[PDB]
Every structure is written in structure tokens, then in C-alpha cells.
Design a binder for this molecule. Structure first.
Ligand SMILES: [Mg+2]
Ligand SMILES: [Mg+2]
Ligand SMILES: [Mg+2]
Ligand SMILES: [Mg+2]
Ligand SMILES: [Mg+2]
Ligand SMILES: [Mg+2]
Ligand SMILES: [Mg+2]
Ligand SMILES: [Mg+2]
Ligand SMILES: [Mg+2]
Ligand SMILES: [Mg+2]
Ligand SMILES: [Mg+2]
Ligand SMILES: [Mg+2]
Ligand SMILES: [Mg+2]
Ligand SMILES: [Mg+2]
Ligand SMILES: [Mg+2]
Ligand SMILES: [Mg+2]
Ligand SMILES: [Mg+2]
Lengths: 64, 144, 201, 117
RNA sequence: UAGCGGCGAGCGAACGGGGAGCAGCCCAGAGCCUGAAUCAGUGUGUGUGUUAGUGGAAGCGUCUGGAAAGGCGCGCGAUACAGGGUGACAGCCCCGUACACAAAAAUGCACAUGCUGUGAGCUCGAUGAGUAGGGCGGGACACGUGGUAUCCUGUCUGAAUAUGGGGGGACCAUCCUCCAAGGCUAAAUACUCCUGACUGACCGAUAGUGAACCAGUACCGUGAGGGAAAGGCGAAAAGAACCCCGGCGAGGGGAGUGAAAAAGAACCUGAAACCGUGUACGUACAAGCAGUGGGAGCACGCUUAGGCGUGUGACUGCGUACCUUUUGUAUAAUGGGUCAGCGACUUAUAUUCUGUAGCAAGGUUAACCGAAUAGGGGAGCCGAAGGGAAACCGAGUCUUAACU
């Protein structure tokens, strides 16, 4: 039997064709941001071949 | 000619011999050539039971949310593997024995995968830029 | 191809035994072994029970008297109960695919080459219930008690074949890897069920 | 299924237990010897053997000294003469000859003494 | 998994799919026809189990041995050679095993029925209110009041009544589907106090039941309660007549038995810790983890020398056991009186790598069925397509007005 912390993926979750999860950024966005436009410029998720370790505790099937 | 020297020498089952190397790992224990503590011998993983500075916070950090799509799965038609296998009753509906979609779905698509044949007239909705032409060696139809 | 110089009837046939193949042990090993512990819907083994006449808790206090940190009449370390681990019944029983079981079986014509690939007829004068002289027809190979077995895609009456580990009947879709290479003399000649595939007799 | 570890029992123990140069007490009575006595020897023999080739080395060259310095001039100057002499020069243990065949040795002393520039 | 969740532990459905499996009925009523299929109790009978049972195959000589069951040689039986037994390991001795036979009586269950109950079946009926919703407080659904459907009700109220009414997850409309507030129901399904028959890569008396033993005993607690140790002579007792020492004892010596008493009853094998008796070397000016390297000498067996094996070890070079824990240990830190025997990284499901093996753009089955490891079964699972949150696009695709 194996429950996979549904919140682990209930936030930042997907496996690119290579496998590497595209994590995500955030920091200021939507919490309180006013200052610094470019800073805010956010982008679109990446990884940490340093944390993808744990960031893998989950996984299971090709879901969405 | 049997040798009365007290023996034979035939053939049967005396072994298959092999399957996988490394079929053992000091396991069952580790009581052996030394003071093998186990727990690899620090002092704070005794009965393991520990996974701390846990695997959640500061790395499972903030969120970029997600509606978690509705539209069933609706897997893509299949790897352009029509004809000589979709029954042959060209178009496509489900019970197929070399590229099937599973009946619980609804919509289809096609994608531009591998080969076709030529006989294959696909209504049954949706064409990919390519599959339109890929199945130009055929009858593109499409009822949607 | 052929089936080697013959006694009893005619000689042999040109069929296919799925080629006849070579042998890769990797298979037989994993396959015959997989078979041992196969009549195993479960099986005994409870000599365990870390929880015995475990009646009552703690004997000596914790502190005092010295004699070390005592606790629980059932203690594994102690004398009468508690087997630290051990286990339940449990399955053991494996699971072989099909491609493997059905995988490269027989080779008796290939290695026990000179030993077996015989084919005559099922033994019919064989009168209903009797073995008083099944030694009769067992001169039809004269190849003696030599483990030996059979198949005739027809449970018949043949069963007057009881003898410690002498000869056997085992018929129907019931080949059996072990019992194959567990004998040395296994003329099958279930006649027709020797079909390239469905030679399950 | 079973183990009755009791058969590899003394088979494991007698094994060493057979270390009774007396030793003494359980030092060959029980398992105090365990290894704490045999594992002992079992190391003493390593070095304090390995040691001998320097324990019989210094030995000879005490005698070797007493000899040549009893004919005049000692194990220091002595060897010097000897070494300055290619095919003409061998080395101790046999430079023990000074105890079974003096004159032989006493002759070597010569050849050494004279080689001396 | 979709959801729920200090969206934090952890909680997890259903739709739908494969199968085990299969059945629907009465009341809320009058009239008709009239005891009718319907269950259920009871007597009976067969079926079939259960409780006693019956009969059941073939061998001898010959060798060692106390004993043959084995060795050599020849001979039978064989749905029986499964197992147990007998003076050691037996298809042939002894109970069996296959195999075929059974039960005056009793009851299991099935069928057929007698009794009594019950009512079948058509005609005009008739469709379950202090009940559905609801305000309030809890409680049930994976679902924590949340935009929360839906199920209960403490409480306070309270409808339509079938050209009416509930559900389709807040809510409205729409269409789809279904009739609540009254009851009955086989089966697949859960279970071990027992009974019978079969089985074990499950134990072998610190194992296994606490208990192979007159064991929940003796034992300790006012109690509730708690909780042991303790198997073996031999093949048959043939359990040791009689004599001797002794105290009309212990105990023991002869003698008898017997293959053996070195088998003597505290009894099979009989290890260890521990204590005696015999003999040899060492030992009464000698310093310490007691061993190591020398190594004399004696005691001993040796080689028609050749400087040997063995116990010994005067004397002399080094030289402060281990464990564990620590920057670090002779350590004046723990841990060990010594032996003997138990005594701790297993197990199951699930993932992810490695080796390996089998098929390959494929690989594989689950529950289940089974002339039970076979085949049957592809529900389904994984991979060949990625991207965007998602609509959706697709070898693309995001991002942006953007084509960069
Ligand atoms: Mg240790
Ligand atoms: Mg430790
Ligand atoms: Mg499918
Ligand atoms: Mg308590
Ligand atoms: Mg026990
Ligand atoms: Mg199969
Ligand atoms: Mg040196
Ligand atoms: Mg809960
Ligand atoms: Mg009888
Ligand atoms: Mg409809
Ligand atoms: Mg016991
Ligand atoms: Mg015993
Ligand atoms: Mg005895
Ligand atoms: Mg002295
Ligand atoms: Mg010596
Ligand atoms: Mg350290
Ligand atoms: Mg200490």
C-alpha cells in the first residue's frame, strides 16, 4: 500500500519528457509584491538537481 | 556398455545453475567479521523511523496552481496505427488489437506517429496538421 | 526431423516441438524452481508468536536490584517465548510468465538426445485394471524402471502404475517441467497431441 | 528451519581452545584465553619473530667485534677493510666462523687489515 | 486517483469496468371465484452423509549377528509400494493400504408427502405526514461549514398527496431518471468451542501449547490475578535368587541376567564450566596482562652421526587483556565470576535502481474458470508524445500583439 503525499504534488508537480520535474518559483507574486517589476518577472518552473532528490518522494503514474 | 566399476554417467536435472548475480547482501543480519553495529552506527537512526529536517518545507516551497483538467483522458487517437488492426472497419471505435483507446473516453485526435498503410478512411473526429496529409494516402473524411 | 532408431512400431515422425531449440538454463532454472512450492495455496509455519503466554507486564521494577532493565515475561531474549521475528503462513509461491513456461522447454531429443525422443503407440492390449505383468509392456522399451513416463491425451485405465518412484501416467494438458527432466526415460507418444504446440498430454 | 547452533559449538571453540602451552588458568582453561591470550601470542609471534633478524644480527656483530678487536682493531675499522674488496667480501652469520675455526677468521682479519689503504 | 486537510500530519471515494453471484414477494381491500403455487412447523419415505462394522494380495532357503527387516542367489502380489508397527534398514511376517461390502436405532441435509397453519389467481380499488423541506445544536458520507448536495435528529416547526412528488453536489431553468415515510428474502460472504478424514522445504523437550510429565497443578497474592520446573534402562524386566562387609541402614564388593550392567534403575549417548588420584619436566635471591624470540638442561622416542619428534622450560631481547565510548584509554570509566544452551536488521505490500532472465514497439496479466502449477481470462497496468495551469495545440508547444 503506498500513499503519496497528495499535497507534495498538490503544488508544483509534473515530469518533463526527460523526467526532470519542472518545479516552480514564486516568492513575492500574490503575497505582497508591489516593488520591482522585473524582479517579479517570475518566469516558469525549473529544478534543483540538488533537491529533485526529495522532490521525488512522490511521483507515481503519468497523472495530471 | 555399462561399467561394473560401480557407477553410471547419464543426463537429467542436476542443475539449471544460474539466474542473477549478487544474490545475497550480508543480509539476514550482519553478525560477522566484526562489530557491525548496523544503522551504519552514528546514534540517531536506531530503528530508522526517522526522516527529518523533513522532506516537506523550504524545498516544497510556494505554489503555482492548477485546475487538474476535466476532459477525461481522451488519449490521442493512437500512434497513427490505423488499418490492418482497428478491426479494419475503418474509422475507429474502441475494441482494437494493435492501437486501442479504452472505452470510457469521448474525443480522440490523431497525432502524427508511425506509418499507416493506405486503406483507412477516418471520420471519428480530428486531424493533426500532418496526419491530414499522412493519411492523404487514404480518405481523410472526418465526422465530428 | 526424424526421431532416431526405433523399437515397437514403425519408427518416428517429422513434426516441430516449436523448433526443438537449444536450452538456455536461465529459463529452466527460474522455471523448474518457480515450480517447487507450487502446490502452495498457502502452507503451515506459525512457529513464531512473539506473543506467547505473554501474560502480564514487567517483573522486576525498572530501577533497583541492578539485574538489568527487566521488562516483559515474553521478552525475545528470555526463556520461554518470543521469537523476535519469524512469520505467518505466507505464500512463497512465485509467478512465471507465459512466454517463459511455454518458453524453451523440451530438449530431451537435443541433450538426453541418445536418451529419449521415442514414439510408438499407447499400449492397448493393456487390460483394464491390471499390473501383475505391466513388466510385459515394460519390455517394449526393455528400458526398465528407468524413471519413465507417458501421455496419451486420454486418461484410460493405464493407472495400474503405482511404484514408489517407478513409472507414471500423468496425462491431460499436464506435462510438467520437473517430472520431464526428473525422469530420463519419457517417451511421450500421446500420438496426436504431439502437435507442434498443444502437446499438453 | 532449525539451527541448534550447538554443533558448530566447541568445533568453533576447541578450535583455539587448543592453545595450552600452559598459558595458565583460564588462560588455557576457559575462554579468557578467548583470544585475549591466543590472539595475544598470535601477534607477539608476528613482531617478536619478525624482530629476530635484528636480534641475531646485533648478536653476530658483538662476537665479530670481540674477535677482530681481540686481534687488534675493531668492528668499525674492520668492516671497512673488508668492504673495500669486491669479490673479496662476505657478510656475518658466517662472520661467526670466529668461533668454530679461529685461524680462518684470524686470517680474514689479515686480509681485511692489509687491504686498509 | 478526484477530493477532504493547521491543503499540515494523514485522510481517501465514486462513475465506470472484469468477476463470485443470481430470486423475487406480502400488507396498507371490496367483490369474485374458494382452500389452489406460497413458506412454516409436525408424522412418514427414499436419497445421502454421520454414529458400530465386513472381508481383504505375495517367500523362502542362505551369510554376520543377541536379535534380520539388510548382504549374495532364486521366487511370487501389485488400482494394495500410504503410512504404523515386529529383537537393526521388510511390498511377501503383524494392523493396514486399493478394493468391494454394509446399520435393529438416531439424527444432518435434500428431495416426495400426510397433518395444521397460511393463501394462490383475475375484476373495480388503493399507494404509507407529525412523515419530505426547513430555522437552531451536533452526528453520517474520504469530504474538517467550506460556494457543501446528500443521509440521521435533540429541538423548534411542518408540504404537495400523483395532470404530485425526491435525485442528477451550492442555486435556477431544462430534459433525464425515481416514488420515500410499512414489512419479507436463498446464495456467493465472516467465523473455530468442537467432529472427521488429509497435509507440512513447520518444532524436537531452554524448541513446540503455560503444560509430551495427574498443568492452569505445586506454588505466591486478602483478592482480581500470576505461574513453574519436571521426557529416554532394555529388544523382553530377564528389575538382579544367593554370599560377603554394614547397624536386620545407607551404600558397596562377588555372583546371576544379558549383545551389553563401561546398560543397574539417581538408568541411552554423556561435552563445558568446576573438584580429586597417577606420572614427567618446571619451582623456595625472586618483580608486572604472564604471552613472544631465543633458548640449556632433564624426562622421553630417534636417525648403522648427520644435533630429530614430545611434555618441560633455567636463563636472557620485547612487552601495561579485550569490548564499548571518545580528541583520547593499561586506564583509577563502563560490561563480563566461568561454562553450557536460547539470544537481534525479519516480514508483507508498494516503488525505484543493479545483475539476470523471457518476449519487443511491445511486454504483462488481476479476480475468476480449470480434464489446478497447465490452458482458459486482456478488466486493466506500463511504454511508444511532448507542451500549456486549462480550453487546446502537437513533433512540436509554451510565453507575448509578435511572426524573434
Ligand atoms: Mg561484539
Ligand atoms: Mg553503539
Ligand atoms: Mg484496455
Ligand atoms: Mg498494565
Ligand atoms: Mg514456548
Ligand atoms: Mg496462464
Ligand atoms: Mg633489519
Ligand atoms: Mg476519519
Ligand atoms: Mg478388517
Ligand atoms: Mg431513456
Ligand atoms: Mg518446556
Ligand atoms: Mg536431552
Ligand atoms: Mg551412562
Ligand atoms: Mg634459583
Ligand atoms: Mg621455541
Ligand atoms: Mg572516533
Ligand atoms: Mg574496566
Amino acid at each position: 500500500p503506498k500513499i503519496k503525499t497528495v499535497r507534495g504534488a498538490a503544488k508544483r508537480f509534473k515530469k518533463t519528457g526527460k523526467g526532470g520535474f519542472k518545479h516552480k518559483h514564486a516568492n513575492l507574486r500574490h503575497i505582497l509584491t508591489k516593488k520591482a517589476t522585473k524582479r517579479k518577472r517570475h518566469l516558469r518552473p525549473k529544478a534543483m538537481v540538488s533537491k529533485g532528490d526529495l522532490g521525488l518522494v512522490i511521483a507515481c503514474l503519468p497523472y495530471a | 556398455m555399462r561399467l561394473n566399476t560401480l557407477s553410471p554417467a547419464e543426463g537429467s536435472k542436476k542443475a539449471g545453475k544460474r539466474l542473477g548475480r549478487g544474490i545475497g547482501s550480508g543480509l539476514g543480519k550482519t553478525g560477522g567479521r566484526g562489530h557491525k553495529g548496523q544503522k551504519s552506527r552514528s546514534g540517531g537512526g536506531v530503528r530508522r523511523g526517522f526522516e527529518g529536517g523533513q522532506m516537506p518545507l523550504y524545498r516544497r516551497l510556494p505554489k503555482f496552481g492548477f485546475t487538474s483538467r476535466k476532459a477525461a483522458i481522451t488519449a490521442e487517437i493512437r500512434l497513427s496505427d490505423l488499418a490492418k488492426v482497428e478491426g479494419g472497419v475503418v474509422d475507429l471505435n474502441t475494441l482494437k488489437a494493435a492501437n486501442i483507446i479504452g472505452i470510457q473516453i469521448e474525443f480522440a485526435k490523431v497525432i502524427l506517429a508511425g506509418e499507416v498503410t493506405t486503406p483507412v478512411t477516418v471520420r471519428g473526429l480530428r486531424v493533426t496538421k500532418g496526419a491530414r496529409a499522412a493519411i492523404e494516402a487514404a480518405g481523410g473524411k472526418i465526422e465530428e | 526431423m526424424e526421431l532416431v532408431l526405433k523399437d515397437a512400431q514403425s519408427a518416428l515422425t517429422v513434426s516441430e516441438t516449436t523448433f526443438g531449440r537449444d536450452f538456455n538454463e536461465a529459463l529452466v532454472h527460474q522455471v523448474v524452481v518457480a515450480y517447487a512450492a507450487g502446490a502452495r495455496q498457502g502452507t503451515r509455519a506459525q512457529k513464531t508468536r512473539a506473543e506467547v503466554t505473554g501474560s502480564g507486564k514487567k517483573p522486576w521494577r525498572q530501577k533497583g536490584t541492578g539485574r538489568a532493565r527487566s521488562g516483559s515475561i515474553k521478552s525475545p531474549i528470555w526463556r520461554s517465548g518470543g521469537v523476535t521475528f519469524a512469520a505467518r503462513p505466507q505464500d512463497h509461491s512465485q509467478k512465471v510468465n507465459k512466454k517463459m513456461y511455454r518458453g524453451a522447454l523440451k530438449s530431451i531429443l537435443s541433450e538426453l538426445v541418445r536418451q529419449d525422443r521415442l514414439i510408438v503407440v499407447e499400449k492397448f492390449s493393456v487390460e483394464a485394471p491390471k499390473t501383475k505383468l505391466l513388466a510385459q509392456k515394460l519390455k517394449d522399451m526393455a528400458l526398465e524402471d528407468v524413471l519413465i513416463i507417458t501421455g496419451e491425451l486420454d486418461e484410460n485405465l493405464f493407472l495400474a502404475a503405482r511404484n514408489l518412484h517407478k513409472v507414471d501416467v500423468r496425462d491431460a494438458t499436464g506435462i510438467d517441467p520437473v517430472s520431464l527432466i526428473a525422469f530420463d526415460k519419457v517417451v511421450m507418444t500421446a500420438d496426436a497431441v504431439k502437435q507442434v504446440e498443444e502437446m499438453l498430454a | 528451519a532449525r539451527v541448534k547452533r550447538g554443533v558448530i559449538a566447541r568445533a568453533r571453540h576447541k578450535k583455539i581452545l587448543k592453545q595450552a602451552k600452559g598459558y595458565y588458568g583460564a588462560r588455557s582453561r576457559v575462554y579468557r584465553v578467548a583470544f585475549q591470550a591466543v590472539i595475544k601470542a598470535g601477534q607477539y609471534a608476528y613482531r617478536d619473530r619478525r624482530q629476530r633478524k635484528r636480534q641475531f644480527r646485533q648478536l653476530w656483530i658483538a662476537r665479530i667485534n670481540a674477535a677482530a678487536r681481540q686481534n687488534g682493531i675493531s668492528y668499525s675499522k674492520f668492516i671497512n677493510g673488508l668492504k673495500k674488496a669486491s669479490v673479496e667480501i662476505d657478510r656475518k652469520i658466517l662472520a661467526d666462523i670466529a668461533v668454530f675455526d679461529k685461524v680462518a677468521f684470524t686470517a680474514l682479519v689479515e686480509k681485511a687489515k692489509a687491504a686498509l689503504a
